[model samples]
Target: SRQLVLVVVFVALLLDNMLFTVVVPIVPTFLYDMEFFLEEEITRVGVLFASKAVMQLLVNPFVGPLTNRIGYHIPMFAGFVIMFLSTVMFAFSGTYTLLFVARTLQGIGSSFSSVAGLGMLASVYTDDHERGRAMGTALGGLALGLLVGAPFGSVMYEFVGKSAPFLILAFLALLDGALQLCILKGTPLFMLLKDPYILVAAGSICFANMGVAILEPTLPIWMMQTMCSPKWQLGLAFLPASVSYLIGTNLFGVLANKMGRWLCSLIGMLVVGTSLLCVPLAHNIFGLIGPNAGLGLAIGMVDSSMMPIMGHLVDLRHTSVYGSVYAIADVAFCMGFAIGPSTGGAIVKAIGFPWLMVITGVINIVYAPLCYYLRSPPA
Candidate 1:
């Protein structure tokens, strides 16, 4: 039963990560192929990237209450259906407007599915001890998705055209929906609103998510625009960060168990802040890689520790609360996602990439100390 739950959670997280990062390596090409916008306009690209988060931000806040009322599986199924449809739309879209619509729909779907899936995973776990491990494993799967999906998506885009990747993702979404229906049929809704610790932890995670979203959407664009590296090297540049995330997730799981979730979270936030600071200092590919590696490590630590803390923040009687908390975080993530690209692009346009990085870094640095104030369940 334990192993089965683990596998289910892992698969769900893997799908989420794949959907999240699948377009990162190909967005430039997709925009170029459609010819809806100019290549030199970083602001346009940033808006296009921010569009997904904008949709998500609008949709995610409602997901928590909905999940609490309904069981996780039903909402998850609905999310998958929407995602599949959006992917289909993306595959067939010839116009830039249609592309934005499809991407927006996809973001909404992702928000719902992610909240439902996370709530379900937290439901199966008993407490922080085991929950940390579960969260780590789940995040590890997500990290693996980042490591694998970007490269695979890039290759598919190169060989089969941009639409093929979305088509494949559509099929995968359908399969995941079916699996959810079959395996999660008996899981019950667990209400978890009474816990104050869960609320604070949720807020902290939301802030961390905001930081991440702001950075991720613009990072690829920054690399492509600022660096003189070849197209292939752009994808390769992500490897170091991806590797760090994978390792950090697994390692932090054990660390959280030993050192406590709140402490681990603070450490993770600090690492991320430090990494963001280093981005402005990067002048070459080698310099960029160093900061990126730190960013990856920071992400790994935060993800692994935060989810586990979430699991503990609520009681067994209210398992659905974790999902609600996560949903809130997703909303923050969407907000950050919306803000990151637009803000970063504007900064770059007004001043330069260096100043933009410095600004982002300064904002992120505040997260660590904020995390220190967050309350968690007793260890």
Candidate 2:
């Protein structure tokens, strides 16, 4: 049954992540082509990049309690509807205003669906013992989505044009919604809200996700600017991190089940901190790759443990609430995500890309100690 559920959730998560990763590589290019944006509108592009995170920040706090009151299916369905509409608008957008609206709406949809899906996954698992493996499997879907979507979207952009990819994403959103409706039966929302551990676990998720958001977008830009590399080379930089994350998640998932969630989380945090610190010291692609790989591994470990911890923190009866809490963390993540890129860009503009990496690394290192606060399941 767990295996079956994992499979179902994997598919759902894959779809969700694809929606996110697909648009990222093309966004700058898309805006560049539009007459309204202009070449100097880089800040505007940053704002556009940050828009989804802003929307998620606004929406996440409310989603948790609301999901508890309602259920996962309806919210999930609503999210898909919003995503589908937004994607369509994005594909057809003729102006910056329309693009802004589409992007913001997409953020809203993403927040809703993400919360619903996470809550459902958490509800099924029993405790931290199995949490790491479960979450690793689920997050693997997310990582896989990025891996698949970036390449696929890039290919589509290369062959068909920007609008075509958006169209494809729209269709995917609709199909995913339908799949959610068919697969997920009912979720237990109310019971999960009563647990204090859930809140702590959720907080941990927020911090880690925030760290990811803060670094990911600016990474490529930093590489290009500082290393004097082409834009396409950003993908190469990401390769080590991506592969490491996938491996780490799977490895730590098994470890979480054997050793413990808290321990795994602590280890993950340390790895992440070290990786972040390494960024500032990197002199070239090879130098960055090793540290980035560590960062990826850290993310994998934390993600593997975090989701399961949330599951254990809640009651079996309130899957919906768990999902909502999961989404709420993402909301925090989005906010950090928005800030990280803009902040990095600003730092780079002011000082340099090297300095930007150094600053980001220092800030991210703070999260390492915070990992200790995360709760283990009750004996």
Q: TM-score each candidate.
A: 0.76, 0.72
In candidate 1, the residue pairs with backbone N, CA or C atoms under 3 Å apart (3 or more residues apart, or in different chains) clash, namely: 191-318
Q: What stretches of model 2 exceed 4 Å from their correct place?
A: 1-12, 33-42, 61-74, 116-139, 177-207, 224-236, 256-264, 280-287, 305-321, 324-328, 370-379
Clash totals for all candidate models: 1, 5
State the lDDT of candidate 1 residue by residue for 219-261, as single tens digits: 6666666675555455566778788777776678667778877
The whole-model lDDT of each prediction reads: 0.67, 0.66
Q: Candidate 2 on 1-379: residue-level lDDT in tens? A: 5565566567666766776666665665565445431224445656777888888878876877788899876787778788788878878887788878987888888778777766776777778556568876776677778777755665676568678877877776666655555563334333433455565555555555544565555554455446766434455566676788778877876777788788787777666666776777888877977887888888788778887766555444354442354444554466566776556545555675456555555544565555565544453
Q: C-alpha displacement of 170 in model 2, angstroms?
A: 2.3
